[PDB]
Each structure stands twice: as structure tokens, then as C-alpha cells.
């Protein structure tokens, strides 16, 4: 019984955008403030059972100098400068083990896996704490409503800033070819990557699968699945805070970043996805301002194109970087 | 379709207790450190539509001087010194509105309603933030696993301390009869009250309904409901952290507090409660070291005795304070 | 999933009304027949633990002299004549205990709580039996299909008559200010109150929250929740009886009463309510012929505005009666 | 998902019986009172599309002369006196159409199908009303709690009396061999048959499949399915009425009837049945005082043996009657 | 919360049909190839407990001379040549016991019950195997995707051919009136019957209830129920095979057969049916090229009209055959 | 709210084994019959985007010469002879793409991935057909009851033979170190691997995670999840076939193979696993006749140890092979 707009409508779907007059200023100032702290990227080579890949334990300074973990996986190859995928992680995930991230290396790409602050407890473990802007306001369980009463205190202000800085950290690794740095993610990872496509000066291509954190007002109207339902549940209780909540969310909405993003991108969507509804994904894709393609999977839910989509991504990047 | 131990077994159920050798020292030090900050209780009389009750907006210093909101409701009665109920709130709730707490005042008791730090977003709104001990470690969405890797950082260290200090703040109000201060709650509120029944020197009676935060190791093995499932889900991912997690929780387990509590108590239990299973409630009741009674509701789930139990509580206190 | 018409369409939703030519005559004759039995209101003061409120055990004659229970709660105040709220109860509920109805008394209103015939066994206990018009026809479990093959035998004929008579009983209490009698309820209580707003000559204001018993034909096509599903399930079996069922229901449909009601009203609606869908609520609101306001809660289900709405009601009445 | 006692324990399961001292007196007086009214059986031959069977529209006097509907289906055969099955119907069922009951006629048996007072609205239509003992007390939706506060007013007193009288009515039809009258049913129908097996002097054999209305106290503890859950839901609300409820139910419990029943019986049971749990079925079977067999279906739920069981019944009766 | 197009749209719903240019050639060749094998119908009279009906154990040659089981039930009547219903069976069913099919015989019709190859394990037993066209390709569990990458290997090619030949077998029985041979089924049985109404030269009337195997592309878009979901799940995995899957299904789509069928038909449809959605049933009914009626059940799910529809079918055939 | 035996009982759980006298003879003959067809292993190097791994498209002869697909992935390393993992696949999966199997190659092992006959349509695509032993008997949807009425026709006879032959095919590849061939799988893959540990003379160690196809009689009594429920559903219908079904299954039960298996093994088990209940896994582990260890994950469901367990396997094999 799930259904969004028909495909012909989805392809033309361009809802009115809402953002505050200071959207750009907010992000400029946020990034400037964090850039005042040295990146201090650390890549510690590890003793590992992996044989085809060199694994490094990563640390770097993200939001306000806060130290973020990651992995760096380098495939053992003759080529001196290698292309690079900066990988962002889905909701309730974390960096896990180096072996959880063998795809891109196996395809000949260095992979920088960014750990997600405060999460890492749902489906894959993580090692990086969050650090709040002082008091942690009343919230619904999870990360979606953490600090939501003000953009400056909002959880994803910190995540997005870490994500922008992760690309700088990857770029600092000597074996990375800076002309071929890719930002990638699915769901939460895709919404992060979308922000980064607008904010980073270093990223050269975007892989954005079944993106989360897009078109919040519609998402919350359409589905009662988690994690978007964290927001709805907040609003069910804090009935006086509707305007404020959506004002805050406007600064983090992937649709508003997409409108600013200029790098080439490959999107994916599942037309039966009731976690990240197709209309939210198409809103972002349709506003995306760089060269772009989308793979559409009519019969898939939130798994999207799965391993088929991974192949499409390899082919897409090969072609782009020739 | 849910079933725990048979009632005859429940009434004898006395599982081996597990606590660390420094349980008492941990709490002594915690309370002493927070007592270095002045209580600074504030009772601001409000403009209210309420006619039978005077409503006050409360502020007091809880954990490490952190400012905690509440309500004080005083029934308009001839009697100069009135008995007092300190009310703690269930999971995902908050102090809401003064009119949400009209029972005890209508029964002739001053009511001090403690707002719950960081919550107030699920079923009733709240106004009080949490403040973490530095970094907010990776966690499962919610409050159950917030800081769980160390008792000093654990969420309920802060809440329990707030709750002890709430009794002090209530006692400071001039119309409160200090010989008749009651601590009360259901589920999370009951878990909090149980802690307070061991840690407070001011409380004179305990009302403990369908208590949560009891017998964690058993809870997690019996039910897959929330909020106990937050802990299970954390353990599913952080497979290396089992011993630490349960070590931490031993400092907050209502069964360990029950063993230390000396004041008279009225407990309630629902034999079909699959949020707070009867074996966890009985383990706390059975170890409870003060004079005690329990009302048993054989066909009820987590709603327990509802309004029938409210009557029992009114009768229990009337007799006790005679 | 759940979504009704968009808000802008809800606000203009005025479906074609269906009623029989004898609607008014049916109700005139029903009321006249019951008025031939004396009201014989009895208010027995009770021994109570309540301190701020005087409680009375109520009996009064409703449908065809049948004796209906209730509570009268009188707040202890200086004022001689007090305003009064006649409170109707949700489905499967009953008058419970006096202490279940402290809100309005606390706000300075006498509260007359009407027990619901034959129900009182789902979420709050009741003490009043139903009396059928002779044989109790085949029915689906519950009260929705009880006597549904004829308006004269239909369950809500008896309830609505009781409810009209409850206002008269409340008005007969000496401390009640007859210029300030309010009729109030949510869901079933809201549907009852809406009928009473049309049929009573004594009621001065209506509070109608998330009303049930409105726009039955649409309700049954939109949702499969209880209690509306009792009707669907009856029609699934009695496939020959569709026209008769909807003809019967037409006499009891809150939309048809709304069109006749002239007193001032405050409605509420939850846009995600799948027990009483927004389109059924708006159909009644939009046809409501008295001076009217509605509070709209976009993210709420059947809980509606909860405690926020209770505040809106106190403010609405104060302004209305000043 | 569901499991009752192991089969080896079920075979030995003989729980302590509870009944009042006046069990037999209550039923003697009940039957005597209803026998003061003339049976007045009516068998109206119908215009029917059926070719192999003669269909009759039946009326007879059941509880206190109340007129109960039925079907009589007579297979067109040479034999002058035919054996007869009196068929009782499952919960929320009714007599439906004559073609709904072609099994037994096809097997050469006259079939008397008894309509069920007040039901007939869930899965098959019915035509027979209920007639309460005056006021219809507060109840949970359905038939299980109708009049449950007193055995004199309890719904199944009426149904069981109709059912005893149905056998009388069948026996009055001239083509019926009175030496070969069988009483049959499944679930509610089985619970009714079991009562009739103890109370009727005309029945010659019992078919009792997956019987309902057995061992209530256990049923309610074991499963949360309907219809047993109507009782649990009533007890969750009316918390003061537990002793009275089970006192009443004791007069209608199939286990108490089984202990008095002397005619030959074939039972069936599904070991995965969570509507009528095996332990309640076995408690009845085990106390059953006549010659008895049971067919055990280890992998079946409430469907039991289905068409396999029907064959077992035909074989069992053939052997019994030859 | 299930709904298809509104009824007034359903009645006009005529979606664009898709079929390959060799649809007729495919079926002509398929039938001709199976007709090269002798029908070799066997009717073995059985020892049976049935008294009003003669039962025969049936064997006949279906797809490529493969031996299919069945039952023949002949009502014991004076008339020499009787009318005949060829009955096809629902998904996961089989021919069961002769006593499972007493309706039509009781109504004066010989009944030929066709067993379903490879099924017979879900709700009623079966005795007939399937015989694949060589290798059994990767498939989702069930019969819907068995051989779906090629019409020649597809499961329903074999079933439909069995079904055409079952009419021939029935016609070969000497007591069968060949002017009054009816083909009938519900759900899968209805989809089979609809194919046979196009492909058989012997059938004289169609009873088609809540037909399955219709308008596959829409079905899969609308509902996530089984068995249509078998297809969706296959497509979720085999993301490269969408075009081939629906090309294959086009040769077996009840809508494409309906457009070729010329015999008189009675359809039924449940407007809340979420197994066989109304729009798929109406697409088939609307394209049906013979004389036709539809019974519409607005409140029923996949049960459709149940026993009310059976009565309509008897009346329909009586009128047509006079 | 699921639970199997307590861990201390699980560790001692050794249920009575049931097998037929000809268990060994059945497998000797099965293997000898298939060995009469040449293995004819084909390894075709592929054009691939993979850089750290060489991919081969595999074909080999399994059951009765039937041609099975696979992948061989060889990591690019200096070492001449490499250790090898033969990987079997979970239920409804297939060989998918080479990039789906990067773990073991990345750890320095050649990986031979066996495609699963007739599956490949649920979560990962497959390319290998099944070939039945003639007719495909009536079955419940899926593979668990395919040919279950006879061990000779049973689906897993074919799968387990394929799997024994897959090890021979891997051993035939020149770079494979035959002293370091590992057999591996989870769930269905684990059940297959367990059979192979008993039947293959070439395997050197077993990795067996959360094994399926174990202790069938118990599994079916404990859980109603798929795929074990396919058997239960079959038995619900074919009520006369219980003894036959379990006799057939005894030949394929992982507990019976475990008793014969002599190679070193690492098992894993999730104590909350309700697909493969812990009692079935422990019954196999406890009868396992080779040197053995088990990793126990107390809080995990069917995911077991996930990436943690992968690490344990790499460490286990390194230690074993020194």
C-alpha cells in the first residue's frame, strides 16, 4: 500500500523551496569558525589481517576542532596517485571495522570512511563522541531532534562540518589524486554528501543514493517510519514549536544544498522507498544544479539498486574521469 | 501471550544481587559534590486560570548546580502546614502544564512536579535540558544508553541526583509539612523514586508503581519492548561492551536501592506488564528493606491499577500519617 | 501512511448532506416521549477523600425514564452561582471515579459527568445499564451496530436522549449558573455533545474535540480502525442491509445536527487522526451553524491537542462568558 | 510464537475443578422454567434451488419461550427414518443460508442448524435476536461479558437453554430417527455442544471440535486472542469484579459439563491453537465422563483437522451407530 | 486504509492493453501440441460415505499429456443429462476430498473439480505434480515466478492448458449435458477460468469471482500482498529482467483473454479486496467481450460476496439456461 | 519476548538423534552416482572493474552432472599457492556479482562462491537452475518441501551433492593450496557446509554460522518464522504425511552430519535468533565430532556476531593453519 507521486509527476516535481535569507552566511561563518582549528590529520598504519589493502586508523579535526575518527583503506597498486572515495555512513551506523568497507579499494579507489559523531550503536559500531553546544535541550530519542530549536545548536551542523573537513583530511593523504575525490553515501550518508557537494571546494563528484535529510516538511507528512518520525513525534508534543523546528531544518535540507551544488552527480531512488520517499529524493535531484543522472528502481524499497547500483557507480566514475 | 514467573514464585523471587564494592561511596561522593552548589530554590507564583490551587513555577539546582524546572501546586485550604507529594515523571515525559497534575492537590496534598532533564518530547512536554559530562559517547537513540560506558557519565546519575535535590527543594517551601513528604512515581518515575527512597534523608513514604530501572539483566532477557530494548540494541552492536554496560547499570538498579531503603512503601504491579515485567518489579519489592505493601493487578499490563491504585495510595497515606 | 484531504480542501469540504424528511419529527417525538417521565434528578453528597471539591453521586431519568448515573463535582469556592460543564465520555468508557474528572472543577466550573449506558468496560469503569427496545437484533460486537436496522431501536437514540436530559439535570442543581452551561466531549463524547447542541434548549456553549459519529459513509470508506469498523464488519456480512444501515445512521450523524446547532462552539481536529478522520470532523465543523472556531493540530493523531487544547478551551470560555 | 503444555502433560492434565454447590440446581431450575413454555416447533418447507435436499425454515421456543431460528435440511433418500445432526455455530456466526450446511445431508443425515441469538454479524449472517434479563449491564463489546456479573443474567444461560431445546425441536420432526441424534460443533459450537451433552436427555452422541468456553481461568492467563480477551479486557477495567466474574463463568464452563456428560464423544484439538488453547481443550476432554476419543492435530492452529476431521466424524458415527 | 479508484472511475476503467503480436499464435501452438496426446479421461467410481452424490476419481491428460487429477461429483437425480460446472481452485489449494465440493451437486449440477499441478499444500491438499520444461530457473518461492523468463516455460502455460483440457474431459462424461457446461472459479480459479473462456470451444458460461492473474503491472504497483508480491520480490532482485518479466506475463493476463472471450459471464468484485484489487478486476470485466454482469460488494475484501454470491450464481445460470 | 533453553542447558543439550539405518548408504550411493559424471570444472577469466582481485566465471558438474555456476575470486598476491574458502549462500540468495564476495580475497584467501540451484531471487540474484527428479510433487511455496515425500527426490539431496562437488572444483584450480581448503556459510550456507564437513574428503576446516537445516522436529515446534514455517505449513495441510516428512528430513539434518564430521570447526550462535533457534544450533554443535569452538552472542538475533564474527574466523583460521 505505499505509493508516492506517479513517476511522470516525480520527474517534474519542483516544490517551492523555503530557506532563510542568511542560509549562506550561516554556513560561511560555521565553516570559518571550524577552520580556525588546525585540521591535524592523523593516518596511523595498522597491523591488519587484510592483505590486498593498507589500513590506516584516521583522526582529524571536524566541527570546532573536535576529533573525528575514520578509516583509510588504500588498495595495494602500482599507480602512485589513486582516486578517492569519501564515504559517509547511514543512520545509527559508525565506522565499524576496516573490512566493512572493501568495495571501493577493490575497485582501485582509496576509501576514506568517516565515523559519525554520537551514533555507532544501531547496526555498525562507532568510536566518535558528539559534543553539544552547551545544554542538551529536551528532545525525542535519537539524533534528528538534537538541538533542533536553533540551527547553531543543531546536531547536523556538527556532522556536516565534520563531513566537509573529512574531504580536506582525505586530500591531505599523499597517495590521493586530488582531481579524483568522490563524496559518497546512502540515506543519511547521502544527505551528508549532498551538503558537502554544496559546501566543499575539494569534492569532484557526488554519489547520492536514496538520500535522507531532504524536503523535511513533505517527508513528515508522507511517512511514519523512522528516522523522520522522530521529528513528527517531537512536534506531536511541542505543539508550540512547529515554525521554529522547520526554520531550523531549512538550513540542513538537502534540497537547498542541491540548488547550490555544481559538481557532477549520480543519484539513485527506490520508488517503493518509505524511509526516504521518492518525492523527497526527486525534489533534491530536480533542484540539483550540477551535471546529473539518476538511476530509478521502480520495485525497490530503501535498499534501492543494491549491488546493481554499485556497478552503475563504478561505470559512472570511470566515464567521468576519462 | 506474555507471561513471567507464576505469582507464587514471584512472591519468593530473590535473585542474587550484583553491585560493585564502591556502590555507596559512588553515591556519597556524587551527592556531596552536588551539595557544594547552593540549592537556590525558586517558587514564582503564576497567573493561572486554576481556581482551587495556587500554581508556582519552580527552579532548583540539581546535579552539579544544573537548574531544573518543576511545578508546585498548592491546594487552597485552611490547614497551614500541608502534606507533600514529590512527583517524578515517566519516560519521554516532562512537567507539561500545571493542570496535568491536579490529583494530589485535589486530595489535600501540595504537589511538587519534577521536570525530567533532556526528555519532555514524547507524551508530555518538558522544559529542562540535560548537560553531559563532556563528550556524548556513541549511543542508541534515547536516554537508557546515554553515557553507559561509565557510571560517572551515565544519564541517570544526573536524574537521580536532581531527584534527591527535588525533595530538598520541596521541603524548603514554607507551607510544606516536613513530616509528611511523599516521593512518588510510575515506571521511570517509580525507578527514580526508588533511588530517592535510598538516597534521600528527607522523604517519609514511597509510592512506587510498575517500576522501571529494575533488575536490568533479567529485563533485557525477558522483553523486547522499549525502553529496555535500547540497552539490548546497544549490546547487539557493541558486542565487546557487555561486562562494562552491566557494571555501569548495577549503580542505578532499583533492586540495589530497595535493599537500602527504610521508609514505608506502597508498590503496584501488573502481572501482564511487558514494559516492566513482574519479575523485575518483584525483585525490587522483595529486597525492599522498609515496611511495605504491594497491590497486585493480575490482568493488567503497564497501566497497572490505574484509578483503583490511586485510591489505594490515598488510603495508604491517610493510615500511615495517622 | 495515513492522509486525508489536504488542509486547504478540508477547510472548504462541504459534502452533500443526506437525511430523511422526518429527521426533526423523529427527534421531537423522541424527546417528547421521554419528557413524559419525570427527570427526578437526585444528587447524593458523598463521603470522599477529595478536599477542594464536593462530590455527588447523581441519578436522573434519561431515555424513557431509564435511570442514568453520573458524578457532580463542585469546586469549593466563594462564588454562589458557578458555571458548569456537562461532560460526555469516550467509547468504552464510563463515569469511573469522581477523581477522574478534576480538570473543570479546578478551573472553577461545576462538572456534571454523564455515565454512558451499557459501556464502562474498556478504559474506565461504568455503572449504568442499557435497556433495549425489546429484542436485541443480530449485531457486530459493540455499540455501533446495536439496533441499527431501525432508528427507533438504535443505541444512540437512547444515549443522545440521556445526554439532552443530563443538561436538564445539571441545570436543576441550585449552584449552577444557567447562563453558563457548557456541553463538552471528545470522540464519542464530541459526537454526543454535537447532537445535544442541536437538541438541547439549555446548553450555552459547545466544546467538541475530534468528534466521532460524523459523516459515517465517508468514515467507513476511509479507515478500518475501531469503532467505525464495527459498521463495516456488519455490512461485510449483512450485504442486503446497506441502504437500511445508512438510512438509520443519517438520524444520528453529527453533520446533520451541526447544521441545526446555533450555540457558540470550539472544535479541535488532529490531521493525522485515523480514528476520527479529518474530513469527517471538518464536514461537521463546516456545516456547524453557530458561531465557531476550530483548533487544528497538523501532526497529532486522535490525542488531538491534548493539554494544549484544554488551555484553549478555558481561554475560549472565559472570553465567551465575559 | 505459541506453545502450551507438552503433549505428554496435556494427556494427563486434570486441573482442579471449581464450581458452586448449586451448579446442578441452577441448571435444573433454568431448564424447568423454559419448559413451562410450549416448544411450538415450526418447520416451513421452502422454495429452494437445492435439488438433493429438502430445506425447512425453522422456528422453536428456546430460553423462556423466546423464538429461535434455524434450518432443517433433509437429504432426499429412500430411508424413512434418518439419523440427525444438530449443528451449533461458531462465534459471530449465524444460520446463514441453507446451502452453507450441505455436509451432513450429503452424508445421509438430517441436519438441524441452530441460529445463534444476538450474533450473526461477523462471518455468516443470522436472524435471531437476544432478549436480555432486563437491564443490559456495562460490558466489553461482544457476548462473552454480556450479563457476566450474575449467572441468571449471563448470555450463555440463554444460548445453552436454546441449544437443549433445539435437540427437542429436531426430535419432533417425523423423519428423525431419535436413536441417532448427534450434537455437533466447533469452537463456540463445541462449547455449546458440550453443555448440551450434559443437559439434554435426547442427544445420542457428541462431536466436539476445538472447543471454546472451557477452563476460563486458564484460557485468560494463556492467550490474548479474541474472543477470550473480551473477558480479560473487562477484568482490566472492573478490577473489583474478578471473584464474581469467575464465579459466574463456573456455571458455563465446558470442563464442568464434561464431568457430567455420559454419551459417546469424538473430540479434536489443534496443538498450535491459540484461540482455544490445547490445555483448555484437554481439561474438558480429560474430565469427559462418557466413552470418548480425541483426534490430535499437532501442527494445526484453530482450523484443527479441517476436512480430515470431517471424515473422522463420519467414520466414528457409522461405527457407533452400527 | 486500503482504497483503489472510486467506483465511478472503476466502471469506466479501460487501461491500454499490452500484448505481443504472437499472443494468439502462442496459444494456438500450445493447444495443438497438447492435443497430439490423447485425452484418455478416466472416471473411477469410488467407495464413498456420500449418499446424495456419486463420486468419481478423475484422471486426464493436460499439458503435453501430463496426467492431471480431479473429482467428478454427480448428484443422484432422475434427469438423464445434467448441467455441469468445471471448478478451478485457488492459490495453494488442490482437489482435497470429494466432500469439499458439495455445493454445485446439491444445486443439481455435475461438478468436475480440477486439481492444480504442483500446488495443494497451503489450505487444501492436492495430488497432482508439476512437470517443468527442463531446468527450473531461479525463482522466488511459489508458482508466480516459476519459468517467468520465457512464456514457453512459464508455469501458467501448463495450468491453463490443463484447464482447457479439463472441460474436454468433463464433456466426455456421458451424463454431462454439453449445452450446459459452466467454467467457474475464484481468485486463481477465476483467472484460470477467464483464460479458458477465451481458449475453450466447449464452455458455455463463465463464473468469475474476485479474479487473480489480471492486469499484472498495475497489481504489483498497488498491493504488497501475496501472491502478487512474489513477482515484485523477484523484480526487486532481478533488476535487469523487468521488461522480460512483463512480456512473459502479457501472454497470461486475464485482461487479454477477456477481450477475446465471447460466452456469457457473471463476475464478482470486492471493493476492499487488497489481494485482487478492484481496478485489476474491473480492467478484466470492462474488456470482457461476451454478455456480462458484475456483482459489486463495496465493503468486502477478498471474500467477495461469499454465500450471497453463490445464490446469485445459481439464479444467473437458471435464467441463462431457460 | 522470544527465548529458547537457558544457556547452561543449551551447553548440555544433546537430544536423542533420529536417523534411518541406511543414512550412510543413501549418501554413499548418491555421491557415487554423481561421481560417474565428469566434474569438468571451467574457470573463465573475466573482464572486470576489480583491481585487487582476479575474477573467474565458474561452471562445474554437481548433482548427476548438472551444471552449477559460481565465482572464483583470486586476490593478486606474490604467494603461489593460496588458502581457499568455499562459500555457500543463504536462503533465497545466489552468486550475485563477484564484488559481493570481497571479504575472503581481501584476507588473502581464494574464494569459491557456489551458486544455489533454483533460488537466487530473494535478496541476491542467481543464475543456476534446479532439475527435479521427474514430477514436482505438490509442495508449499519455496525449497524446504520440494520433493519432501522421498529423500531421493528431496531438493537438498541435490544442493548438498553440488556442494560436495564444489570443493572438488575449487581443489582443481592450480593456485589453491589443498591443505588449506575451508568450507563456510551462514544459515542455509551453514547447514550446507555442515553436510559437506561430513561428506567431503577434501575440506580441511569448517566455519558454520547460525546454521539452518538442523534439528527439524524441534525447529518447527519452536518458531513460526520462515523458512522453517514452510514445513509446518505443509504439515498443516498434508495431515497424513507427518511421519514421512520427518523421515525424509532425517537424511538432511545437520545434527546427523555433525555426528560424522571430523574436521576442525568454528561455530557461532545468536541467543535471540528466532530463524535458527539456539537449541537447534547447539544440538548440532554439541554432536559435532571434530575439534570445535563456538562463539556465543547473547543479545543478537539471526545477524549473530556480524563483523565481530568475521574477525574471529580470520583469527581462528590463522591459528589453525600455523
Curated annotation (Swiss-Prot), chains A, B, C, D, E, F:
Keywords: Calcium, Carbohydrate metabolism, Cellulose degradation, Cytoplasm, Hydrolase, Metal-binding, Polysaccharide degradation, Serine esterase. It catalyses: Deacetylation of xylans and xylo-oligosaccharides; cephalosporin C + H2O = deacetylcephalosporin C + acetate + H(+). Coiled coil: none annotated. Activity stimulated by up to 40% in the presence of divalent cations such as BaCl(2), CaCl(2), MgCl(2) and MnCl(2) at 3 mM concentration, but inhibited by 82-85% in the presence of CdCl(2) and ZnCl(2) at 3 mM concentration. Substrate binds at residue 91. Optimum temperature is 90 degrees Celsius. Activity drops sharply above 90 degrees Celsius. Stable up to 100-104 degrees Celsius. It is found in: Cytoplasm. Changing residue 227 to A: Reduces catalytic activity by 33-fold against fluoroscein diacetoxymethyl ether; 8-fold decrease in activity against dimethacryloxymethyl ether; 4-fold increase in catalytic efficiency toward dicyclobutylcarboxymethyl ether. InterPro entries: AB_hydrolase_fold, AXE1_dom, CE7. The active site is at 187 (nucleophile), 273 (charge relay system), 302 (charge relay system). Optimum pH is 6.5. Half-maximal activity between pH 5.0-7.5. GO terms for molecular function: acetylxylan esterase activity; calcium ion binding; carboxylic ester hydrolase activity; cephalosporin-C deacetylase activity. Homohexamer, formed by a trimer of dimers. Also exists as a homodimer. PANTHER family: CEPHALOSPORIN-C DEACETYLASE. This is Cephalosporin-C deacetylase.
